[PDB]
Design an enzyme around this catalytic site. Structure first.
Site, PDB file in Angstrom:
ATOM      1  N   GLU A 769       0.836  -1.204   0.000  1.00  0.00           N
ATOM      2  CA  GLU A 769       0.000   0.000   0.000  1.00  0.00           C
ATOM      3  C   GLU A 769       0.873   1.257   0.000  1.00  0.00           C
ATOM      4  OE1 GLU A 769      -3.679   2.257   2.367  1.00  0.00           O
ATOM      5  OE2 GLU A 769      -2.903   0.360   3.150  1.00  0.00           O
ATOM      6  N   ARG A 847      -8.506   2.882  13.285  1.00  0.00           N
ATOM      7  CA  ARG A 847      -9.356   1.732  12.994  1.00  0.00           C
ATOM      8  C   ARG A 847      -9.412   0.791  14.190  1.00  0.00           C
ATOM      9  NH1 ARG A 847     -12.109  -0.473   9.207  1.00  0.00           N
ATOM     10  NH2 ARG A 847     -11.553   1.146   7.679  1.00  0.00           N
ATOM     11  N   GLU A1228     -11.007  -7.659   3.966  1.00  0.00           N
ATOM     12  CA  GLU A1228     -10.489  -7.745   5.331  1.00  0.00           C
ATOM     13  C   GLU A1228     -11.378  -8.306   6.438  1.00  0.00           C
ATOM     14  OE1 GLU A1228      -9.737  -3.485   4.730  1.00  0.00           O
ATOM     15  OE2 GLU A1228      -7.981  -3.867   6.010  1.00  0.00           O
TER      16      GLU A1228
HETATM   17  N1  LIG Z   1      -5.475 -12.922  -3.017  1.00  0.00           N
HETATM   18  C1  LIG Z   1      -5.324 -11.743  -2.388  1.00  0.00           C
HETATM   19  N2  LIG Z   1      -6.439 -11.255  -1.696  1.00  0.00           N
HETATM   20  C2  LIG Z   1      -6.529 -10.091  -0.997  1.00  0.00           C
HETATM   21  C3  LIG Z   1      -5.168  -9.224  -0.997  1.00  0.00           C
HETATM   22  C4  LIG Z   1      -4.043  -9.809  -1.741  1.00  0.00           C
HETATM   23  O1  LIG Z   1      -2.948  -9.091  -1.722  1.00  0.00           O
HETATM   24  N3  LIG Z   1      -4.179 -11.026  -2.395  1.00  0.00           N
HETATM   25  N4  LIG Z   1      -5.228  -7.907  -0.064  1.00  0.00           N
HETATM   26  C5  LIG Z   1      -6.192  -7.701   0.867  1.00  0.00           C
HETATM   27  C6  LIG Z   1      -6.334  -6.416   1.466  1.00  0.00           C
HETATM   28  S1  LIG Z   1      -5.296  -6.086   2.702  1.00  0.00           S
HETATM   29  C7  LIG Z   1      -7.373  -5.537   0.905  1.00  0.00           C
HETATM   30  S2  LIG Z   1      -7.519  -3.980   1.671  1.00  0.00           S
HETATM   31  C8  LIG Z   1      -8.306  -5.972  -0.311  1.00  0.00           C
HETATM   32  C9  LIG Z   1      -8.282  -5.028  -1.420  1.00  0.00           C
HETATM   33  O2  LIG Z   1      -9.206  -5.369  -2.294  1.00  0.00           O
HETATM   34  P1  LIG Z   1     -10.497  -4.985  -2.593  1.00  0.00           P
HETATM   35  O3  LIG Z   1     -10.713  -3.568  -2.048  1.00  0.00           O
HETATM   36  O4  LIG Z   1     -10.691  -4.960  -3.931  1.00  0.00           O
HETATM   37  O5  LIG Z   1     -11.469  -5.923  -2.035  1.00  0.00           O
HETATM   38  O6  LIG Z   1      -8.222  -7.397  -0.588  1.00  0.00           O
HETATM   39  C10 LIG Z   1      -7.669  -8.334   0.367  1.00  0.00           C
HETATM   40  N5  LIG Z   1      -7.651  -9.610  -0.320  1.00  0.00           N
HETATM   41  C1  LIG Z   2      -2.318  12.174   4.774  1.00  0.00           C
HETATM   42  C2  LIG Z   2      -2.330  11.102   3.711  1.00  0.00           C
HETATM   43  C3  LIG Z   2      -3.479  11.375   2.748  1.00  0.00           C
HETATM   44  C4  LIG Z   2      -1.059  11.122   2.874  1.00  0.00           C
HETATM   45  C5  LIG Z   2      -2.430   9.695   4.383  1.00  0.00           C
HETATM   46  O1  LIG Z   2      -2.458   8.573   3.341  1.00  0.00           O
HETATM   47  C6  LIG Z   2      -3.293   7.452   3.734  1.00  0.00           C
HETATM   48  C7  LIG Z   2      -4.030   7.479   5.119  1.00  0.00           C
HETATM   49  C8  LIG Z   2      -4.797   6.447   5.462  1.00  0.00           C
HETATM   50  C9  LIG Z   2      -4.890   5.245   4.381  1.00  0.00           C
HETATM   51  N1  LIG Z   2      -5.760   4.006   4.682  1.00  0.00           N
HETATM   52  C10 LIG Z   2      -7.100   4.170   5.690  1.00  0.00           C
HETATM   53  C11 LIG Z   2      -7.456   2.508   5.535  1.00  0.00           C
HETATM   54  C12 LIG Z   2      -8.598   1.914   6.231  1.00  0.00           C
HETATM   55  O2  LIG Z   2      -9.337   2.822   6.986  1.00  0.00           O
HETATM   56  O3  LIG Z   2      -8.843   0.721   6.129  1.00  0.00           O
HETATM   57  C13 LIG Z   2      -6.569   1.861   4.725  1.00  0.00           C
HETATM   58  N2  LIG Z   2      -5.605   2.749   4.249  1.00  0.00           N
HETATM   59  C14 LIG Z   2      -4.209   5.249   3.133  1.00  0.00           C
HETATM   60  C15 LIG Z   2      -3.409   6.352   2.810  1.00  0.00           C
HETATM   61  C16 LIG Z   2      -2.650   6.429   1.486  1.00  0.00           C
HETATM   62  N3  LIG Z   2      -2.095   6.490   0.476  1.00  0.00           N
HETATM   63  O1  MOS Z   3      -6.309  -1.915   2.955  1.00  0.00           O
HETATM   64 MO1  MOS Z   3      -5.393  -3.649   2.768  1.00  0.00          MO
HETATM   65  O2  MOS Z   3      -4.208  -2.939   1.723  1.00  0.00           O
HETATM   66  S1  MOS Z   3      -4.525  -3.722   4.756  1.00  0.00           S
END
Ligand SMILES: Nc1nc2c(c(=O)[nH]1)N[C@H]1C(S)=C(S)[C@@H](COP(=O)(O)O)O[C@H]1N2
Ligand SMILES: CC(C)(C)COc1ccc(-n2cc(C(=O)O)cn2)cc1C#N
Ligand code: MOS
Ligand SMILES: Cc1cc2nc3c(=O)[nH]c(=O)nc-3n(C[C@H](O)[C@H](O)[C@H](O)COP(=O)(O)OP(=O)(O)OC[C@H]3O[C@@H](n4cnc5c(N)ncnc54)[C@H](O)[C@@H]3O)c2cc1C
Ligand code: MOS
Ligand code: FES
Ligand code: FES
Ligand SMILES: [Ca+2]
Ligand SMILES: [Ca+2]
Lengths: 1299, 50, 99, 50
Positions: A769, A847, A1228
């Site tokens: 990310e 969160r 998640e």
């Molecule tokens: N197979 C697979 N599934 C996964 C992931 C991945 O890296 N591989 N990432 C996860 C995380 S941490 C997130 S936030 C979401 C992102 O996908 P989506 O928003 O499209 O559901 O999928 C989940 N499922």
């Molecule tokens: C200040 C600034 C915009 C740079 C912070 O950037 C972020 C802050 C929070 C999140 N983030 C909230 C969730 C969740 O709530 O699941 C998951 N990811 C992503 C970014 C990015 N890129």
């Molecule tokens: O929002 Mo998933 O990339 S921990």
């Protein structure tokens, strides 16, 4: 000699300049252009590099097929061998092989990076056994890891080879026809009639000699005693690659017939030292089936160990001699050979001798009693005699493919027909710097009888003799000492049983003598069928398999490193800090400059723009003046090959001056080192709440971190154009937007000059990310500086050290409740270890606080959060984003409330549960709260109550094994914690042939996002998915995209795509009306002919979001995803191992867009949670240096780790009017449900403590996460844990004690 | 015409779903795209011309 | 671009329509995945038609930014753009023209 | 176009053209071409998939 000749997929390969250091994996990918085989760890524990090898075996006069890890196989061992890779059995361009078709159609492929390796493991099995049993199928994957699927679909799909709607239909599978398999290369079958000849290969630094006869080997050893022998290379490969070792001369004796001979003699069975472990296993299995049980005691012990020895790939190449002579402290075989007195025939030119292995064979660390000129010729495993019994045990962190914590071989010889000890040998591994024998202890029992007194005397002896200093390498001092005694207890009981004839022992003790036994699997997936009248072309709601699954099973799917390198493309290797906190006094590159192919060393001074980066301008691109964590990036080496870049970087010399470091959460609190100020959510009247409470419970809890372990590590390719600062990058990242801006910031150019393209990621899970920029920006700088394209893919050890992981959490809580179990007050202070930068740590804590309630209504509550600033790599997002930690803490005190109240846990959870319409602690109304439905249905389908009785009965009938059962609910708030990130854009083009190209801001990491988007577009446009396509994600098609995260990608991009489709339909309307009976193609061309644009953007913004921690008001989320899971386990109270017997899950994903993908997300997330709470653990030295940097030490869930009975159901009739086509985010939310296994385990532990520990039914013992075998065994306090003690045992009793 | 730079094309086959990315010295990216797709027998959305 | 300076003219046009320096505008290439179904660059009408398509796209951008400009009259182009982004307003659009 | 770097596995193509204004192609023999070092293949009408 020189010429190396072998075959790859039927094609002959002639390598005129084979370098001994070249592995098959590197050769396949860099020389042959076969990129289907992947690099996942480089240490043999993931199987991503699995391939099949075939050769003519002269001694057997037969063609043999076996699997092998291409990352450890030296190509120099492959002369006249036929290799078969994933591309050699089938493809989407020709035809998929049944194995590839089934794993794809059964949904056994998500990100797809592990698919080729698993495909080859399965394929190899079938070439050996076209009709395998379910057990043989499961065993084929002891060496393959998958992080996405949860394994269930892979096994269920392959199970078809053995001998509510459904996710797949076996009846459509093409039958396996072995007559149509590729033939063994005819040319090789001819070469078999040509007597072998010694070969010589010369590399850059190594000389390899393939010895053809015993005489040549002995002459070579006499001439070059220092030369290292190599057979399987599963040790030497590790030493060369990870231990900074270099052996200038290697001799491979694998071809020598005497080293491969098997002889059945009157005293036992002899094996040539070169025989593979798989061969030993096969021969021994046949012996056990043919010979009387009384003669196969030792054989049986060997088989038991071999059962848990690496995987099929390693066992098929690993030799007997290699394990014995490597003499590792943790060898699983040497303790068995030593205890059984296995005969070793040692030879040298002109000399021969045979000696039984005893305690003297291993003089010191890594040494044996062999002379420098001698080699191990053969080994004779003895038949057991009458009155002679044997046992072999192994206990690690994970059952499959793991390193022993303690391993042993135990033998006893009684006087004829008596219970009187004549001989006794207890040999252990993992208790010293070598395999040892507890001689002092065993010698005292000679002539004594097998009874309780002997058991007690031996245990006390072991506790005194096998001591461990507090600083013993590997730690876990208490656990290891306990295993040494526990293993003997098991041996003691087993011997009583064997002495008992049978051809007495307390019934509740019997199970302690049983060896691990697999249970038949049972999987069920329940979901809703789509409306009867729904068109076949409308795939929304149907179990459509991942659009790229077939290409991932065929190895045709392209991941970053699979992209071909330009002829002038260079490689980059990061130079990182080896100190946790220190000043950089100087950097010397004098040595690095000498490495061949060296191009340059880059550092902070080379940056043209800014060296300030990170989400909060918290970091350096390259360390300046000081380093703040081990792994802190100081600079980078650029070279012509990856090997040269690595070797050069390794010799860059950095001079440091240590500075005070803050490592742990405890250290941070003590030194007041935090990021920002305290976060807090408070509602109600705490002071009052605790006043009304009948009972109050307070305590502390800890949950360890977690490494993402995406099968594909971080990777970036940067292409500098040479014009206006332009640069195009191919990156494995979930955040193309930040990658783009960070690169532009470092370069000092406008963002419009940078293009970032993301095809797919072999896993992300949050680890990509943001942290993917650490590599991307470094690679971009190298491209800028050299003017050449440059790339870098991290090795697993670099990845685990540098990129960060899940945040470890420390919690201090206090809960007030009534005798009924109702909660009235709760205070929880959270502390996370954030690392050396802020990154996503703040939002993660947010969160966490948002979920400290889980699914329970708490009138008065106060939750605080602090981010600990420490000298460790910066931790980041990981599936759950803080929620799992807070949810775990919540369930922990909830479990203590039930026990304290003496009420059923599920009863207590149910009465404290929110109800439709309630407000959360952060004041958001819960609309469509489905937990109640999921809960009732789960209790019903899992037969919870009925099984709760079975569990109790089992515990009454078993003294050293206990079962636990627990049902847990969960709720997850959906939406980014940052309001403005909840936006999404799409771009759609319809070409003149009617084909549609869809582009959106989201990226594919295996979750099936593009698949779902294609399903959406198809429904909205009312055309078949066959006419829609999504190629990649790029910053020049959809700008300013939020990272693919927070599980909302389907939600927001689905809406953006939907909107874009509506605009398209609106434009085509006029032509549809003009020509009603026309085709989609007709209307599109008519529009084009009438000059109507067939291109448009789509955009979506999640409405009404914006929470404030200041006023505890505002909508934090758009809606919640719910689910419930019930898990049952069985723990071995003597070893810490446990079985996940059954898990039933009921998840609410609204009206699923694709039940196959969603069930996959549920199973995948559940297994990662299972890993977090019960198997995965990262260890650091006191100075902050990570010890666990690979699959060998970091154990994620394996095929055999999943619940034997795995049932998953998607809640029916629960449409979500808050999201696209009534669906719900699923990424998640399911992960925390993995905690159901953790609490079932704690339930089982309570049964064990009640059995041997205390009698206090209300005792609250602490159990931190992860509940590993160490924690499980240590918690099962008994006479054994007590004898070992830990600090000031029966050894030191204080002089005085207050009265 | 005698354009100083003569006709030139670079074609990169991806190996997935018939995908191909081409760098071309042309004033007509549209026809280049459809003609290449027609010859290959794949949908136009599989071909990228730059 | 074949030497006639089409991209140069488009940047000049975009700059005038958006009221910002050309230094803040860039044109990298022409690709079928950004603008589809394009007529060949010929008939000497490229400046004419693409100039109009660029103009329209620029107008759409200005419209989306207007609320933020009026809200902060003395701010910079950068301030308005960031404000629009954080207010979740799309900063991407197509432009089209037909003679 | 040609200034774009070549991939390490990038090959080169040379068109084979007619030396006659109008005629029937009776046969094509590549036996000599196949001898030139680095030769990979000769492509013709029958190789077209679409
Ligand atoms: N197979 C697979 N599934 C996964 C992931 C991945 O890296 N591989 N990432 C996860 C995380 S941490 C997130 S936030 C979401 C992102 O996908 P989506 O928003 O499209 O559901 O999928 C989940 N499922
Ligand atoms: C200040 C600034 C915009 C740079 C912070 O950037 C972020 C802050 C929070 C999140 N983030 C909230 C969730 C969740 O709530 O699941 C998951 N990811 C992503 C970014 C990015 N890129
Ligand atoms: O929002 Mo998933 O990339 S921990
Ligand atoms: C993923 C993975 C999992 C593993 N799991 C386990 C495990 O569970 N338990 C365990 O005990 N080990 C384990 N190992 C260690 C390894 O696989 C064994 O030690 C194996 O038998 C080594 O044999 P090899 O033929 O590959 O040895 P090589 O690496 O080819 O050689 C090892 C050493 O033995 C010497 N040698 C080889 N043959 C002779 C001979 N005939 N005479 C004299 N010297 C000789 C060499 O000179 C060298 O020092 C694992 C390794 C990997 C990569
Ligand atoms: O229309 Mo110009 O390309 S002759
Ligand atoms: S890369 Fe070979 S086992 Fe992981
Ligand atoms: S599908 Fe197996 S690791 Fe991603
Ligand atoms: Ca990571
Ligand atoms: Ca951090």
């Amino acid at each position: 000699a020189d010429e190396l000749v072998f075959f790859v997929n039927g094609k002959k390969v002639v390598e005129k300049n084979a370098d001994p250091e070249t592995t098959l994996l590197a050769y396949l990918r860099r020389k042959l252009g076969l990129r289907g085989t992947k690099l996942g760890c480089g240490e043999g524990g993931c199987g991503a590099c699995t391939v099949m090898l075939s050769k003519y075996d002269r001694l057997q006069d037969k063609i043999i097929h076996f699997s092998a890890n291409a990352c450890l196989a030296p190509i120099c061992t492959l002369h006249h061998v036929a290799v078969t890779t994933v591309e050699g059995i089938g493809s989407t361009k020709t035809r998929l092989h049944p194995v590839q078709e089934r794993i794809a159609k059964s949904h056994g492929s998500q990100c797809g990076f592990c698919t080729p390796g698993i495909v080859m493991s399965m394929y190899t099995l079938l070439r050996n056994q076209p009709e395998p049993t379910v057990e043989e199928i499961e065993d084929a994957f002891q060496g393959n890891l998958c992080r996405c699927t949860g394994y269930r679909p892979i096994l269920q799909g392959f199970r078809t080879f053995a001998k509510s709607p459904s996710l797949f239909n076996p009846e459509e599978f093409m039958p396996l026809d072995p007559t149509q398999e590729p033939i063994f290369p005819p040319e090789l079958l001819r070469l078999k009639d040509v007597p072998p000849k010694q070969l010589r290969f010369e590399g850059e630094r190594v000389t390899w000699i393939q010895a053809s006869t015993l005489k040549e080997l002995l002459d070579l050893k006499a001439q070059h005693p220092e030369a290292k022998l190599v057979v399987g290379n599963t040790e030497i490969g590790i030493e060369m690659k990870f231990k900074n070792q270099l052996f200038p001369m290697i001799i491979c004796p694998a071809w020598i017939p005497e080293l491969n001979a098997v002889e059945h003699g009157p005293e036992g069975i002899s094996f040539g030292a070169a025989c593979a472990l798989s061969s030993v296993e096969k021969t021994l299995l046949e012996a056990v089936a043919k010979l009387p049980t009384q003669k196969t005691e030792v054989f049986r012990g060997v088989l038991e160990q071999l059962r848990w020895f690496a995987g099929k790939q390693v066992k098929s190449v690993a030799s007997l001699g290699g394990n014995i002579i490597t003499a590792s402290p943790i060898s699983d075989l040497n303790p068995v050979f030593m205890a059984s007195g296995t005969k070793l025939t040692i030879v040298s030119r002109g000399t021969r001798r045979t000696v039984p292995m005893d305690h003297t064979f291993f003089p010191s660390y890594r040494k044996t009693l062999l002379g420098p000129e001698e080699i191990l010729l053969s080994i004779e495993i003895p038949y057991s005699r009458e009155d002679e019994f044997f046992s072999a045990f192994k206990q690690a962190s994970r059952r499959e493919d793991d390193i022993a914590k303690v391993t042993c071989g135990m033998r006893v010889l009684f006087q004829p027909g008596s219970m009187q000890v004549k001989e006794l040998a207890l040999c252990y591994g993992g208790m010293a710097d070598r395999t040892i024998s507890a001689l002092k202890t065993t010698q005292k029992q000679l002539s004594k009888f097998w009874n309780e007194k002997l058991l007690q005397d031996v245990c006390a002896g072991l506790a005194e003799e096998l001591s461990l200093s507090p600083d013993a390498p590997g730690g876990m001092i208490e656990f290891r000492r306990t295993l040494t005694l526990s293993f003997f207890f098991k041996f003691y009981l087993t011997v009583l049983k064997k002495l008992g004839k049978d051809s007495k022992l307390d019934p509740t003790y019997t199970s302690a003598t049983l060896l691990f036994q697999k249970h038949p699997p049972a999987n069920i997936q329940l979901f809703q069928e789509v409306p009867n009248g729904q068109s076949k072309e409308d795939t929304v709601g149907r179990p459509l398999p991942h659009l790229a699954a077939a290409m991932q099973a065929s190895g045709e799917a392209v991941y970053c490193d699979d992209i071909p390198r330009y002829e002038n493309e260079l490689f980059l290797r990061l130079v990182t800090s080896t100190r946790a906190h220190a000043k950089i006094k100087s950097i010397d590159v004098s040595e690095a400059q000498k490495v061949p192919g060296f191009v340059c060393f880059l550092s902070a001074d080379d940056i043209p723009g800014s060296n300030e980066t990170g989400l909060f301008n918290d970091e350096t691109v390259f360390a300046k003046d000081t380093v703040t964590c081990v792994g802190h990036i100081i600079g980078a080496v650029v070279a012509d090959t990856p090997e040269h870049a690595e070797r050069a970087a390794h010799v860059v010399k950095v001079t440091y001056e240590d500075l005070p470091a803050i490592i742990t959460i405890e250290d941070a609190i003590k030194n007041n080192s935090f990021y920002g100020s305290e976060l807090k959510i408070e509602k109600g009247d705490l002071k009052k709440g605790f006043s009304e409470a009948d009972n109050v419970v307070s305590g502390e809890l800890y949950i360890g971190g977690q490494d993402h372990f995406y099968l594909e590590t971080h990777c970036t390719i940067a292409i500098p154009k040479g014009e206006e600062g332009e640069m195009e990058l191919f990156v494995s990242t979930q955040n193309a937007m930040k990658t783009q801006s960070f690169v532009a910031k470092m370069l000092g150019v406008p963002v419009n000059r940078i293009l970032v393209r993301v095809k797919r990621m072999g896993g992300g899970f949050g680890g990509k990310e943001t942290r993917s920029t650490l590599v991307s920006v470094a690679v971009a700088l190298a491209a800028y500086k050299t003017g050449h394209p440059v790339r870098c893919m991290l090795d697993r050890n670099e990845d685990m050290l540098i990129t960060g992981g899940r945040h470890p959490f420390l919690a201090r809580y206090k809960v007030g409740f009534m005798k009924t179990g109702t909660i009235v007050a709760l205070e929880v202070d959270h502390y996370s270890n954030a690392g050396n930068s802020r990154d996503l740590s703040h939002s993660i804590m947010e969160r966490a606080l948002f979920h400290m309630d889980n699914c329970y209504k708490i009138p008065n509550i106060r939750g605080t959060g602090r981010l600990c600033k420490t000298n460790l790599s910066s931790n980041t997002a990981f599936r759950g984003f803080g929620g799992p930690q807070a949810l775990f803490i919540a369930e922990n005190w909830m479990s203590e409330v039930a026990v304290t109240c003496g009420l059923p846990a599920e009863e207590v959870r149910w009465k404290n549960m929110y109800k439709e319409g309630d407000l959360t602690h952060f004041n958001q109304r819960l609309e469509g709260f489905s937990v109640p439905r999921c809960w009732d249905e789960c209790l019903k389908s899992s037969q919870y109550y009925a099984r709760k009785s079975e569990v109790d009965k089992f515990n009454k009938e078993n003294c050293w094994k206990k079962r636990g059962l627990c049902i847990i609910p969960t709720k997850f708030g959906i939406s980014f914690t940052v309001p403005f990130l909840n936006q999404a854009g799409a771009l759609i083009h319809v070409y003149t042939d009617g084909s549609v190209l869809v582009s959106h801001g989201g990226t594919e990491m295996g979750q099936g996002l593009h698949t779902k988007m294609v399903q959406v577009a198809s429904k909205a446009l009312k055309i078949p998915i066959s006419k829609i396509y999504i190629s990649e994600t790029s910053t020049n098609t959809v700008p300013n995209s939020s990272p693919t995260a927070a599980s909302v990608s389907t939600d927001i991009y689905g809406q953006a795509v939907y909107e874009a489709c509506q605009t398209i339909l609106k434009r085509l309307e006029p032509f549809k009306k003009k020509n009603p009976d026309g085709s989609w193609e007709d209307w599109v061309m008519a529009a084009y002919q009438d000059r109507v644009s067939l291109s448009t953007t789509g955009f979506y913004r999640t409405p009404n979001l914006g929470y404030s921690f200041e006023t505890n008001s505002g909508n934090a989320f758009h809606y919640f995803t719910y689910g419930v899971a019930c898990s049952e386990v069985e723990i071995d109270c003597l070893t810490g191992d446990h079985k996940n017997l059954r898990t039933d899950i009921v998840m609410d994903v609204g009206s699923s867009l694709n039940p196959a993908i969603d069930i996959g997300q549920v199973e995948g997330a559940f297994v990662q949670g299972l890993g977090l709470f019960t198997l995965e653990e990262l260890h650091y030295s006191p100075e902050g240096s990570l010890h666990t940097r690979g699959p060998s030490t970091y154990k994620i869930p394996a095929f055999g780790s999943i619940p034997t009975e795995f049932r998953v159901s998607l809640l029916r009739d629960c449409p979500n009017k808050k999201a696209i086509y009534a669906s719900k985010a699923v990424g998640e939310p399911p992960l925390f449900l993995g905690a159901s296994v953790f609490f079932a385990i704690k339930d089982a532990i309570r049964a064990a403590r009640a059995q041997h520990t205390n009698n206090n039914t209300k005792e609250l013992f602490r159990l931190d996460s992860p509940a590993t075998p160490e924690k499980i065994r240590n918690a099962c306090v008994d006479k054994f844990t007590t004898l070992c003690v830990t600090g000031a045992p029966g050894n030191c009793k204080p002089w005085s004690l207050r009265v």
